Amino acid sequence: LPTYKLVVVGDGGVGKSALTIQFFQKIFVDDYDPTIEDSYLKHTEIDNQWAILDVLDTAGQEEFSAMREQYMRTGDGFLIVYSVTDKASFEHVDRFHQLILRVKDRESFPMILVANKVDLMHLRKVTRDQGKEMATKYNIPYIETSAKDPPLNVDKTFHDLVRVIRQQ
Numbered sequence: 001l002p003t004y005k006l007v008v009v010g011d012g013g014v015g016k017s018a019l020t021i022q023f024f025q026k027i028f029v030d031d032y033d034p035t036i037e038d039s040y041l042k043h044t045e046i047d048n049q050w051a052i053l054d055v056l057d058t059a060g061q062e063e064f065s066a067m068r069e070q071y072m073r074t075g076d077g078f079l080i081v082y083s084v085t086d087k088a089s090f091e092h093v094d095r096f097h098q099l100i101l102r103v104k105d106r107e108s109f110p111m112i113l114v115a116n117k118v119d120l121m122h123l124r125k126v127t128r129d130q131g132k133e134m135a136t137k138y139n140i141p142y143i144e145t146s147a148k149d150p151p152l153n154v155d156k157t158f159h160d161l162v163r164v165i166r167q168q
């Protein structure tokens with residue numbers, strides 16, 4: 001089977017780990033005990049094609065560059081995650097896009113823009129159409145997620161990234 005290395009990037013606190021842990025462990029990050037953790041690897045069927053997904057969950061704080069650098073270098077595709085309740089995380093999408101292309105030395109690369117935390121309806125700052133505009137600007141797909149139970153579009157997000165990788 002092919003292995004797809006999927007790298008999750010975005011500002012601190014946007015829910016990169018929450019999306020990853022929901023995808024693999026089917027639990028919300030707050031309820032999770034990382035004590036017994038290992039790497040995020042699964043065998044799964046996408047569009048009638050079995051694959052191994054190896055997910056690399058970056059820490060979002062600027063302090064942690066070695067992890068982000070290495071992870072970016074080895075990635076086959078990226079989720080650029082922001083929180084719809086955090087305007088700065090959305091503005092930082094531009095920087096993440098540029099950073100990925102710099103690390104890859106390519107002018108395009110498999111990516112999906114992920115607007116997380118959409119369950120927080122009364123706290124939402126970044127609109128659906130704002131997200132769609134940002135994605136369209138870079139000619140990348142846009143998807144809204146929630147890692148909080150009940151999860152929204154979590155499996156679809158990772159599966160769609162594989163679809164983009166396959167069809168590039």
Ligand SMILES: Nc1nc2c(ncn2[C@@H]2O[C@H](COP(=O)(O)OP(=O)(O)NP(=O)(O)O)[C@@H](O)[C@H]2O)c(=O)[nH]1
Nearest residue numbers: 012013014015016017018029059060117146147148
């Ligand atoms: N309501 C809601 N809260 C969420 C969602 N995803 C994450 N959170 C919350 O956001 C906070 C940060 O989540 P976490 O997954 O640690 O974020 P991160 O992007 O991995 N942070 P870091 O970059 O520091 O590792 C937690 O309080 C968590 O409960 C979501 O979809 N909805």
Ligand SMILES: [Mg+2]
Nearest residue numbers: 016017058059
């Ligand atoms: Mg994290």
